[PDB]
């Protein structure tokens, strides 16, 4: 269910259940980050004909001087596409100006 801390704490992946004396014992499996990279992120971009784009469960990253997308829970720069973007007919203020994207 899309409920954040209902099935234990952290980034809950999945849960399993086992019988216990007078109850149930749940094993909550969570995604635990081990190491982190500090990166500069953009929560949105103003592209082409002033079209706004927002990242889906991620961020826009300047990688190799080019605008790229990365997931919010794992650093892996990948090209910006309709698969990882929410489109807007107008871009919001403070969205980074990127006329060269798409």
């Amino acid at each position: 269910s899309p409920r954040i801390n209902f099935c234990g704490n952290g980034n809950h992946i999945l849960s399993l259940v086992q019988n216990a004396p007078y109850g149930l014992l749940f094993m909550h499996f969570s995604y635990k980050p081990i190491s982190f990279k500090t990166v500069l992120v953009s929560p949105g971009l103003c592209i082409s004909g002033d079209v706004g784009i927002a990242p889906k469960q991620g961020y826009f990253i300047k990688h190799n001087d080019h605008w790229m997308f990365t997931g919010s829970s794992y650093y892996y720069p990948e090209p910006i596409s309709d698969k990882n973007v929410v489109f807007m007919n107008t871009c919001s203020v403070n969205f980074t100006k990127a006329p060269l994207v798409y």
Binding site: R3, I4, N5, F6
Partner: protein, 48 residues
Amino acid sequence: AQVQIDRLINGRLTALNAYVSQQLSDISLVKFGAALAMEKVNECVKSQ
């Protein structure tokens, strides 16, 4: 004096038992409310 004090002891102990039973029942409602508040924290403030 023991007969009179015994009537008071019995009345006061009965009153403490009644208060204790009510306090157990009230704390059940407080636990229910605290669970709802934790659920509202998690599903309304930290996330939607």
